[PDB]
Coordinates of C-alpha atoms and ligand atoms in Angstrom, one line a residue:
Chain A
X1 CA 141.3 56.9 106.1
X2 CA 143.9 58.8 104.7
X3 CA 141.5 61.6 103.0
X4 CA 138.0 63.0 103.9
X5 CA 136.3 64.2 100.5
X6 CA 133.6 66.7 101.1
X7 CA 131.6 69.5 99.2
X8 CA 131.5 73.3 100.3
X9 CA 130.1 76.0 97.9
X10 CA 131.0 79.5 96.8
X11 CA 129.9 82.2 94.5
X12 CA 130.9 81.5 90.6
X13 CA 132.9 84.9 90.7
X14 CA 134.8 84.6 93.9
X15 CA 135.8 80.9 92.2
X16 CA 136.8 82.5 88.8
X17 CA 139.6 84.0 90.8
X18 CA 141.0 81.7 93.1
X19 CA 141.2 79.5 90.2
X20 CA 143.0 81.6 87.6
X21 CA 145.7 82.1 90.7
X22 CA 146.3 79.0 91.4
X23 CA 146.6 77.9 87.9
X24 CA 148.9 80.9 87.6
X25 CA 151.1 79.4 90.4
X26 CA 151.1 75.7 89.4
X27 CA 149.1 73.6 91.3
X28 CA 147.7 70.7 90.2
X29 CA 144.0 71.0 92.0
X30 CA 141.9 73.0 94.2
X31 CA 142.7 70.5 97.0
X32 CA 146.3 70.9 97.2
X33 CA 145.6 74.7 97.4
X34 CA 142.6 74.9 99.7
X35 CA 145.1 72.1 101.6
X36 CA 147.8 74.3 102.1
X37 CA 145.4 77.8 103.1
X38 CA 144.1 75.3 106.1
X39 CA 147.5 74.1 107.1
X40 CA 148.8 77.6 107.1
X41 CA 145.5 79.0 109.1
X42 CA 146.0 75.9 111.9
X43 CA 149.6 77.3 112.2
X44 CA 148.7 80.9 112.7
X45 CA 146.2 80.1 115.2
X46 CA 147.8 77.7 117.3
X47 CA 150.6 80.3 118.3
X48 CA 148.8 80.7 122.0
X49 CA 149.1 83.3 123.8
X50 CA 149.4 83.8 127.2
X51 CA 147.3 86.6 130.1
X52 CA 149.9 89.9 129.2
X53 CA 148.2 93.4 128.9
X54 CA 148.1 94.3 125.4
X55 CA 146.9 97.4 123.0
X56 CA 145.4 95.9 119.3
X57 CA 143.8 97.2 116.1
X58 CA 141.6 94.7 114.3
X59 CA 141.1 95.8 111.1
X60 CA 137.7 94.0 109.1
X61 CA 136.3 94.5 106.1
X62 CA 132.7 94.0 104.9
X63 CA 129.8 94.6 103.2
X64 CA 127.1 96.4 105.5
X65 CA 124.0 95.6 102.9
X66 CA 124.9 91.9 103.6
X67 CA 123.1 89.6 106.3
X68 CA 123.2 91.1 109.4
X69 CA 126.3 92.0 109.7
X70 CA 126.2 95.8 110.6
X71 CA 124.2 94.9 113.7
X72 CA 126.3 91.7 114.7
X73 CA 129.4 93.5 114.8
X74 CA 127.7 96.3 117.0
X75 CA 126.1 94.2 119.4
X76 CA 129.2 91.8 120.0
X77 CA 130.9 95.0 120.4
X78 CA 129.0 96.7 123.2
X79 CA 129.4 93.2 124.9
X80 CA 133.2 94.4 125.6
X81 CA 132.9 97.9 126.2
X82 CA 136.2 97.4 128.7
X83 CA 138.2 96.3 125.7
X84 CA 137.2 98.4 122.9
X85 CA 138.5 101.6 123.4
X86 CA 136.9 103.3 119.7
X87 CA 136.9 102.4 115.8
X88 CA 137.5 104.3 112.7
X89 CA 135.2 103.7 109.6
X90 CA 136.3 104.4 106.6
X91 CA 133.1 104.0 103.8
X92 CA 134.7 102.2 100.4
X93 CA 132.2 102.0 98.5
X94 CA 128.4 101.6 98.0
X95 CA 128.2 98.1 99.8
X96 CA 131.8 97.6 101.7
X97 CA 133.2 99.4 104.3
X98 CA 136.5 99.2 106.4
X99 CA 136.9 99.5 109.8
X100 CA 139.6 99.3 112.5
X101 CA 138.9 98.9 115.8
X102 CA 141.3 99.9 118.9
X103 CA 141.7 97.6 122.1
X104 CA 143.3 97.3 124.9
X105 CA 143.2 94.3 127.6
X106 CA 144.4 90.4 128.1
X107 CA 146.1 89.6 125.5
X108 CA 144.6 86.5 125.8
X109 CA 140.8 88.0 126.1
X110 CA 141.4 90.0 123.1
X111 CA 142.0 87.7 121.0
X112 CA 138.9 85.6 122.0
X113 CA 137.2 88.9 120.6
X114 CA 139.1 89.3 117.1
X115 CA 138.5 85.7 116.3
X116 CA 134.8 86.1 117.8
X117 CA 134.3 89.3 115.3
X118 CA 136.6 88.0 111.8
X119 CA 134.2 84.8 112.0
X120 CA 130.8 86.8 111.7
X121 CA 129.3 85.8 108.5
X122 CA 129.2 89.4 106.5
X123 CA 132.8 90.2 107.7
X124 CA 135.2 89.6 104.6
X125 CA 138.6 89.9 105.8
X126 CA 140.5 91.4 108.3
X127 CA 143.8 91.0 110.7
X128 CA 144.1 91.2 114.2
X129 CA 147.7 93.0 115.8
X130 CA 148.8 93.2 119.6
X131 CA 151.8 94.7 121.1
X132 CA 153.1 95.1 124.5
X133 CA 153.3 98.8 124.8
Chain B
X1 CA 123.8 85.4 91.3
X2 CA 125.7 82.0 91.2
X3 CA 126.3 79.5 93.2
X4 CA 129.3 76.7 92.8
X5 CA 129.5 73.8 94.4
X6 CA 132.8 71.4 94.1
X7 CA 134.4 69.0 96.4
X8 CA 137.6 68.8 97.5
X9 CA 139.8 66.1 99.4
X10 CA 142.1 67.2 102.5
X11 CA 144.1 65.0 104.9
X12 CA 141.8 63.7 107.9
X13 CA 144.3 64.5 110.4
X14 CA 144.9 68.0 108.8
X15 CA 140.7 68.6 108.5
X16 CA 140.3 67.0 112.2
X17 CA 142.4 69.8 113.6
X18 CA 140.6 72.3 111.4
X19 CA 137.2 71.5 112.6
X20 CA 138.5 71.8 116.2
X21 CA 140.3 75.0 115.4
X22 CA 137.3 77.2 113.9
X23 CA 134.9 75.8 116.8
X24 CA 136.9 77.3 119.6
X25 CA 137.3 80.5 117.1
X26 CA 133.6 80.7 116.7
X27 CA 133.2 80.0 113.2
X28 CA 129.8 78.5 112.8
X29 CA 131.0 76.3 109.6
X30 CA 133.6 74.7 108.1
X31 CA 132.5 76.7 104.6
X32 CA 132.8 79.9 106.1
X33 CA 135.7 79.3 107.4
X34 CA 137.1 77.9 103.3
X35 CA 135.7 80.9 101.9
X36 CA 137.3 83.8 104.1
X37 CA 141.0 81.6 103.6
X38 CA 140.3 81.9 99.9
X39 CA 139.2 85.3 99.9
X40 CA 142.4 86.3 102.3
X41 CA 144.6 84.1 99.5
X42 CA 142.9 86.0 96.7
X43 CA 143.5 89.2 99.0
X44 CA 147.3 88.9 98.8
X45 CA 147.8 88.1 96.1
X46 CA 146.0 91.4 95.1
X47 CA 148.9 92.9 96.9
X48 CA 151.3 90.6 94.8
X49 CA 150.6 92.6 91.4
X50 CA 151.7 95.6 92.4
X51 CA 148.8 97.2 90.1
X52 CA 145.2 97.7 91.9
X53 CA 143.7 99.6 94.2
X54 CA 144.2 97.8 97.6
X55 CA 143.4 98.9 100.9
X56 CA 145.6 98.7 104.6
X57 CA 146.3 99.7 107.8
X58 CA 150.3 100.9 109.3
X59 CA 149.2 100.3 113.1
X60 CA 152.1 101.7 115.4
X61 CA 153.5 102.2 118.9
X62 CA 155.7 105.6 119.7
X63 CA 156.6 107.8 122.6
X64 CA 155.8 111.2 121.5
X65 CA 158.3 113.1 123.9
X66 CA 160.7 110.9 122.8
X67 CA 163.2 111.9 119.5
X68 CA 161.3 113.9 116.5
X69 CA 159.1 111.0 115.7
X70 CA 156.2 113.0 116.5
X71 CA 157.2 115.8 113.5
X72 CA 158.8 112.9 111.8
X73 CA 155.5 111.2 111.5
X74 CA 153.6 114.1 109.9
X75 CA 155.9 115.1 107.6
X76 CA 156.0 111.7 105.9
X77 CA 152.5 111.1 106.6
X78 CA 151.7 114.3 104.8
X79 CA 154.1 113.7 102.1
X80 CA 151.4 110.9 101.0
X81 CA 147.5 112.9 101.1
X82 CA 146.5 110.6 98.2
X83 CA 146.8 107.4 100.2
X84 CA 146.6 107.9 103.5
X85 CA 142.9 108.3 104.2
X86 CA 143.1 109.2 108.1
X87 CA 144.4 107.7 111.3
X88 CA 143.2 107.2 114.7
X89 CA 144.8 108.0 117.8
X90 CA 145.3 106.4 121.1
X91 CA 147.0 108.0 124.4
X92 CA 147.9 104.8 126.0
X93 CA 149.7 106.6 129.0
X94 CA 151.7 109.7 129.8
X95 CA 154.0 109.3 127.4
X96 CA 153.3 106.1 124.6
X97 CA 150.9 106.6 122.3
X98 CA 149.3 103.9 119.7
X99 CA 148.6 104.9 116.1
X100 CA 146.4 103.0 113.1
X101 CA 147.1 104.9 109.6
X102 CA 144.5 103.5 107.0
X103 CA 145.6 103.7 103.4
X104 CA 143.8 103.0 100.3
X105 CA 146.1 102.8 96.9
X106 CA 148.7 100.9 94.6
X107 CA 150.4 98.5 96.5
X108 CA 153.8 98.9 95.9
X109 CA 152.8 103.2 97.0
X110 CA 151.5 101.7 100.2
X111 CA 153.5 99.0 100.9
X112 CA 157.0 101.9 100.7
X113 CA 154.7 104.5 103.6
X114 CA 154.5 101.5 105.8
X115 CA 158.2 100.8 105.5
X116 CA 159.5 104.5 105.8
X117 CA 156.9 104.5 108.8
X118 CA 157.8 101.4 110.7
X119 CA 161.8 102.2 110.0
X120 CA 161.3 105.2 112.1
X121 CA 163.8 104.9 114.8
X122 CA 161.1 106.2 117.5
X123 CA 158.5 103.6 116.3
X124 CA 158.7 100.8 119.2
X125 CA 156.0 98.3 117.5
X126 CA 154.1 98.4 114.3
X127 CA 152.6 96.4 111.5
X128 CA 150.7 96.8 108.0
X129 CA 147.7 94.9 107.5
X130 CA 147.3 94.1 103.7
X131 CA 143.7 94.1 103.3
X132 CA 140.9 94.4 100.8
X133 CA 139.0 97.7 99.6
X134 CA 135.9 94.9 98.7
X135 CA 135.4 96.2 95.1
X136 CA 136.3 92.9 94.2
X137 CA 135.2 90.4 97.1
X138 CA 132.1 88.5 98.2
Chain C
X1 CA 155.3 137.1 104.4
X2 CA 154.4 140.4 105.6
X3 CA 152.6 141.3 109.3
X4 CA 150.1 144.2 108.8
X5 CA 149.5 146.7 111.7
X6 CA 146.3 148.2 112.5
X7 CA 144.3 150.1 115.6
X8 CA 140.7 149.6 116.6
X9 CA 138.6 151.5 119.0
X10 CA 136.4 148.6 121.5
X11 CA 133.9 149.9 123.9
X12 CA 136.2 149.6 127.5
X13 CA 133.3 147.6 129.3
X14 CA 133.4 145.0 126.0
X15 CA 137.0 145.0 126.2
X16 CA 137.7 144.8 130.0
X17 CA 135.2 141.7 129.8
X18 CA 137.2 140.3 127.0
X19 CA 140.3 140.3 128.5
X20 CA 139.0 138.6 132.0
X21 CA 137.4 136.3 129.6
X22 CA 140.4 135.2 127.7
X23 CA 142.4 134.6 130.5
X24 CA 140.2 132.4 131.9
X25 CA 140.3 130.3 129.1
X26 CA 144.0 130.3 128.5
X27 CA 145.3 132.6 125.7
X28 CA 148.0 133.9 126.3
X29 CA 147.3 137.6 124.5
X30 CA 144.6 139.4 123.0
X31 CA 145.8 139.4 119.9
X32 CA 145.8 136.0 119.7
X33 CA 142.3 135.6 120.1
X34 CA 141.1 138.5 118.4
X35 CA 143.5 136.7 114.8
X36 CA 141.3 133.6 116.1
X37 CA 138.1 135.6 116.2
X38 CA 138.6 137.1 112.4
X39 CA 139.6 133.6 111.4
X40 CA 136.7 132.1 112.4
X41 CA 134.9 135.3 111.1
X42 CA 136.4 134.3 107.4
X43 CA 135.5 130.5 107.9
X44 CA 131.8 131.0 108.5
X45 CA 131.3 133.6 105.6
X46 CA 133.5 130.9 103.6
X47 CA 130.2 129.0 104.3
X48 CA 128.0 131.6 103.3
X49 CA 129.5 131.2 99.4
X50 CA 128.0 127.9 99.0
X51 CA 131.2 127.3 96.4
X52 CA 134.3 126.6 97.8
X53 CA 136.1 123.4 99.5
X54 CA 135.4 123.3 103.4
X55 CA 135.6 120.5 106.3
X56 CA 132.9 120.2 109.0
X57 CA 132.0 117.1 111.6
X58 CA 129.3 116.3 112.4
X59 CA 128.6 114.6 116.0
X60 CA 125.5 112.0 116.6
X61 CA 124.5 110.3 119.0
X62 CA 122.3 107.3 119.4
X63 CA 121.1 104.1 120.2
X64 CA 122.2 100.8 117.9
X65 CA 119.4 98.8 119.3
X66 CA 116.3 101.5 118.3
X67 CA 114.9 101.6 115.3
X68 CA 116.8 101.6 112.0
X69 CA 119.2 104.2 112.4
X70 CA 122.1 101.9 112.5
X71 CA 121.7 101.1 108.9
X72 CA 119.7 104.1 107.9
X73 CA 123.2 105.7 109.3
X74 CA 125.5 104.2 106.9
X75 CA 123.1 104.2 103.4
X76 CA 122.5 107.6 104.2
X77 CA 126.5 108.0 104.4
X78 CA 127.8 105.8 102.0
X79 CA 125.4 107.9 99.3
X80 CA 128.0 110.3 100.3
X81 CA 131.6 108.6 99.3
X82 CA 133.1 112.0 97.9
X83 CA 132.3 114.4 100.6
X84 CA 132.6 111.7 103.9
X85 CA 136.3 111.0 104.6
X86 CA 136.0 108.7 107.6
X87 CA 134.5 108.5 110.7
X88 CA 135.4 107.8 114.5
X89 CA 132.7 105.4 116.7
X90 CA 132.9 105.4 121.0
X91 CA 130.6 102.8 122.4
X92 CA 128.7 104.7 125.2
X93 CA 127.6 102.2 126.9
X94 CA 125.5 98.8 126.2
X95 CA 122.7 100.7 124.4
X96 CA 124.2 104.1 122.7
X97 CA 127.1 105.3 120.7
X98 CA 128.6 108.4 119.5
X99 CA 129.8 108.9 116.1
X100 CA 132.0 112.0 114.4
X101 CA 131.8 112.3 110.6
X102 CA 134.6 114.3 109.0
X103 CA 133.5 115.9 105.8
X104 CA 135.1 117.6 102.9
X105 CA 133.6 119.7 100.0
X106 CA 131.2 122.2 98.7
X107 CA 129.6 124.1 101.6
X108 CA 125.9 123.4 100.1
X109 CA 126.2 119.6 100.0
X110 CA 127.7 119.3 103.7
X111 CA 124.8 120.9 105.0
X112 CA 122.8 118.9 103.0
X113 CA 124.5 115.3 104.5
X114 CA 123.9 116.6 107.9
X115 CA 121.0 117.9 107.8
X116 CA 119.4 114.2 106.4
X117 CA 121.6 112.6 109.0
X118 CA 120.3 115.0 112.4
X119 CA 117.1 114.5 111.2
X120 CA 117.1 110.8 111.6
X121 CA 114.5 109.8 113.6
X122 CA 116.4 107.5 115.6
X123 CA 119.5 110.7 116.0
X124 CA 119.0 111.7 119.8
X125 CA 121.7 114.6 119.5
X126 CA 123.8 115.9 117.0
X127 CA 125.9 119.1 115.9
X128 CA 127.4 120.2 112.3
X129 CA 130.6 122.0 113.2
X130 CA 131.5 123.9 109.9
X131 CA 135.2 124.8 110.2
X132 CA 138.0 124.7 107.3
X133 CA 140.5 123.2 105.3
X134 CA 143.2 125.3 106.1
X135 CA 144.0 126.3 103.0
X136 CA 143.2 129.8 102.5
X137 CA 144.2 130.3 106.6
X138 CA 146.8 131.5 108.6
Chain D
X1 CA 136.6 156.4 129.2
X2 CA 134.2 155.1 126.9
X3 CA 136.5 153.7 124.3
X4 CA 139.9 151.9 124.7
X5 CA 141.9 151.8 121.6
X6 CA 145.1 149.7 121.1
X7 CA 146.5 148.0 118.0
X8 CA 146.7 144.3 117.1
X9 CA 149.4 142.6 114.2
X10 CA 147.6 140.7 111.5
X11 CA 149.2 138.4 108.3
X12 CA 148.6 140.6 105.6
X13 CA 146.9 138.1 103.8
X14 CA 144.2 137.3 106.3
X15 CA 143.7 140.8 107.0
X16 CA 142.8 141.4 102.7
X17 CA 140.3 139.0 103.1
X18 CA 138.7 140.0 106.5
X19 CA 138.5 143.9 104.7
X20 CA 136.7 142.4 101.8
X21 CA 134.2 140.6 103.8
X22 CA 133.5 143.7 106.4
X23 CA 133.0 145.5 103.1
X24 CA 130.6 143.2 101.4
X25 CA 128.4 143.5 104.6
X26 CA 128.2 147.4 104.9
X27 CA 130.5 148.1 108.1
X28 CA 132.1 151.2 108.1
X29 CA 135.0 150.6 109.6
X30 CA 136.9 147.5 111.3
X31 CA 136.2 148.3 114.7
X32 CA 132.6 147.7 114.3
X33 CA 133.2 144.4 113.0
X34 CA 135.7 143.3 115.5
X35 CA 133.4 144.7 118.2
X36 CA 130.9 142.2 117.5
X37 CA 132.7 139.4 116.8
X38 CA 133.9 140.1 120.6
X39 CA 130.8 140.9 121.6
X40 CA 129.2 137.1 120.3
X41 CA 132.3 135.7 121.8
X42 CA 131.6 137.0 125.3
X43 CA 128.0 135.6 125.2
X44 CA 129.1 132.1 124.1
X45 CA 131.7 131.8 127.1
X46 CA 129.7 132.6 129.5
X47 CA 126.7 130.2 128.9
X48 CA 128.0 128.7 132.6
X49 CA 127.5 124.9 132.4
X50 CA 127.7 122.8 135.3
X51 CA 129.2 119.8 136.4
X52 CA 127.6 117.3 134.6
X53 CA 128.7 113.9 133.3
X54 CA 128.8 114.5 129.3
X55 CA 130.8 113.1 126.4
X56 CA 131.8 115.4 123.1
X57 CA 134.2 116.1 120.3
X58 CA 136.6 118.9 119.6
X59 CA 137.1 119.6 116.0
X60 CA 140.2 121.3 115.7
X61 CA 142.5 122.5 112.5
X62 CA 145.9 123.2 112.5
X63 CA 149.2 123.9 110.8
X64 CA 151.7 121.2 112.0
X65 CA 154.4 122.7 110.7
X66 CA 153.7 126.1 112.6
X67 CA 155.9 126.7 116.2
X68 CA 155.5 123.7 118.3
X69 CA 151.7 123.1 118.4
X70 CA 152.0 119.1 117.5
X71 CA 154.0 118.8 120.6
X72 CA 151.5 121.1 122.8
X73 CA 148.6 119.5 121.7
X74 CA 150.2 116.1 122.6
X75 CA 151.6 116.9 125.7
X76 CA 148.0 118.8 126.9
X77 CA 146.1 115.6 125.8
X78 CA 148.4 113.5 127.7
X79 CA 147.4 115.5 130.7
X80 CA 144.0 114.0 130.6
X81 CA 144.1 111.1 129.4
X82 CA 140.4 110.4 131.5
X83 CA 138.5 112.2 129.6
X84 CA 140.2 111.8 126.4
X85 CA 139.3 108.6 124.7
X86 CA 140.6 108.7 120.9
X87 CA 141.4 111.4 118.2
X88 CA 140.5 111.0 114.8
X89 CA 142.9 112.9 112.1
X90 CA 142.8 114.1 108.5
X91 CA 146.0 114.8 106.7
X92 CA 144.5 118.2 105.0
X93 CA 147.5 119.1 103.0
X94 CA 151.2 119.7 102.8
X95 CA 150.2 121.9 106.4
X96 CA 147.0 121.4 107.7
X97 CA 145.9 118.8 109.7
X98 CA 142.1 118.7 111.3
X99 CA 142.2 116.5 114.6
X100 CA 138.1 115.8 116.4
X101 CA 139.1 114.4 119.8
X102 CA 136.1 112.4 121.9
X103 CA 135.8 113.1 124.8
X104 CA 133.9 112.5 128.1
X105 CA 133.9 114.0 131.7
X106 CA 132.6 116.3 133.8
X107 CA 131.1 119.0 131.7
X108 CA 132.7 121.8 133.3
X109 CA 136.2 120.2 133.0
X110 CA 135.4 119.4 129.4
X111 CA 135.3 122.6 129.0
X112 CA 138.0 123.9 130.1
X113 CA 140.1 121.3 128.3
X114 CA 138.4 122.7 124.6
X115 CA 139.5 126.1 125.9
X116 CA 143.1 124.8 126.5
X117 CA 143.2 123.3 123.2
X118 CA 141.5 126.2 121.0
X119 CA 143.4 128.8 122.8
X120 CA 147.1 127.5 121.6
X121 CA 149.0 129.1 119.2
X122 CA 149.4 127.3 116.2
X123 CA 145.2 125.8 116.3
X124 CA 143.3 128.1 113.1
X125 CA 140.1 126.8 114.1
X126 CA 137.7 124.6 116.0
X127 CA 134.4 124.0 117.9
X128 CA 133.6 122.1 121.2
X129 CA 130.3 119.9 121.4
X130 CA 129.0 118.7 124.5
X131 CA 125.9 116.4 125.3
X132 CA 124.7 114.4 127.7
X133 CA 123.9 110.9 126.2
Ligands
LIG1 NI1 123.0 96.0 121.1
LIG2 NI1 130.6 102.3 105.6
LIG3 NI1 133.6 85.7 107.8
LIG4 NI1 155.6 119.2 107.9
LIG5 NI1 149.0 110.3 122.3
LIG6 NI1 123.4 100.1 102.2
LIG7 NI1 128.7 101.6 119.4
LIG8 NI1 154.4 114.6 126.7
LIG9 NI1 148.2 115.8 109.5
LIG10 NI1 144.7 129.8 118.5

């Protein structure tokens, strides 16, 4: 089968948007753009990297009145307490705050831990970035 | 509070390798995983209109004994009090240290600090993170 | 500019004591640390006038895992947009952390924030250091 | 001798303001004042600690701008970077900066490190905070 047809559901607001953008744009459906954010996320994590010593910032965003997020992100973090060297928090607003986090270990490792922190429910956005020193 | 649900058709091969992707990530569903790519696509496109408070982070590599770029730094840094909000500050040996500026502002002001930043013939490494401030999100 | 010269008359036992003192530390003169001394002098009475713009940190320290201080941490801080400017986290170990607030603004309301934050039942230590802005120093 | 008297060079501004406070409070002159303020500083840096394991922050404030303090400050960190973990700064205005730097060590080479830093020229202001977790 060339398609696989399935539901997923998200808040009426957050939906308002992404559909006035990508009406603005041009597409056609929901399918062709939720098609291309997928094929674009397989790409960007597929680019593998190897065991090199590297320094990061992962920078999330979220809202610490949802789930348990707050907690979740501190107890995954005193898991690597080799890796994570500190983190600023900045409070932007009455729900949602922004925080970067500084590491430093195998490149490969470290990544494991961004993609392990980005995917906690409560954790709206964020970027990971490594460099060699 | 309210809740949408709509359905959507993506290539098998394409959704296959998406599944296998998130599991290895750690995402614990597949709508999770939707909902944070639309909110990242909703995200820059934020940054897109030039016009909204948007938030980000200039993360950067240096060697302070090297050039001015210590000095350098400050000066532009300071030149900008209304965006930048405050950065952190990493010794990574005797002489390289690692940086992470968070700004909050228009676009178009933040996205011109990262470039005068990163263009900094001291800075080795460095890249901005266009993020959200959350007003907006859920 | 313009460097005012003045004498004073210290007691010869405070003095000698000062002087072995500050060389221990590290100044490299007395004068030095006696501007320092006055400075600080002006910055806590610049307290004392609960009016005026000032910058303090205040250090905690605690355990995520007790209690509800981890959230009762970041209502209590987030009621608190204006005056909190961002703050740094070190994870101690697997049980406790150590957090530094940077605040800005009216004297009276800084004490206030720390005050409700050291008094946090789950807040094993914690310090309010009230210092300045710089602007009205030299 | 009971009294030693020498003469110290202060900004003409910073001097106004330390006369009208001395005033306020009733001194007579500004060698009382001065006295004390040395006389509280003796006390505090000599309240001997140890050499325990602790972890703290030094809030410091400064005029980037003035002599060559940024590059001090840098180099001294770089000296220990063991019991320096991260700095935190806040772009104060056109000049002043305010740095807190964690910290953690032995509690008497703590210390002397706050001392280093609070002693250069060029640092207005700033407090050292020690305690054992
Ligand atoms: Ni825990
Ligand atoms: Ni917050
Ligand atoms: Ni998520
Ligand atoms: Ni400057
Ligand atoms: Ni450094
Ligand atoms: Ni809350
Ligand atoms: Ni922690
Ligand atoms: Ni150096
Ligand atoms: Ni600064
Ligand atoms: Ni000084």
């Amino acid at each position: 089968m060339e398609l696989i047809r399935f539901s997923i559901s998200i808040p009426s607001k957050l939906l308002e948007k992404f559909d006035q953008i990508i009406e603005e744009i041009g597409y056609e459906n929901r399918s062709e753009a939720i098609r291309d954010l997928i094929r674009d996320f397989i790409i960007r994590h597929e680019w593998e990297v190897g065991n090199e010593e590297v320094a990061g910032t992962i920078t999330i965003v979220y809202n610490h009145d949802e789930g348990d997020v707050v907690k979740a992100l501190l107890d995954l973090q005193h898991e690597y307490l080799d890796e994570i060297i500190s983190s600023l928090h900045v409070h932007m607003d009455e729900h949602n705050c922004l925080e970067v986090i500084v590491v430093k270990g195998e490149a490969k490792k470290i990544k494991m831990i961004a993609d392990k922190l980005l995917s906690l429910k409560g954790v709206k956005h964020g970027k990971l970035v490594m460099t060699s020193t």
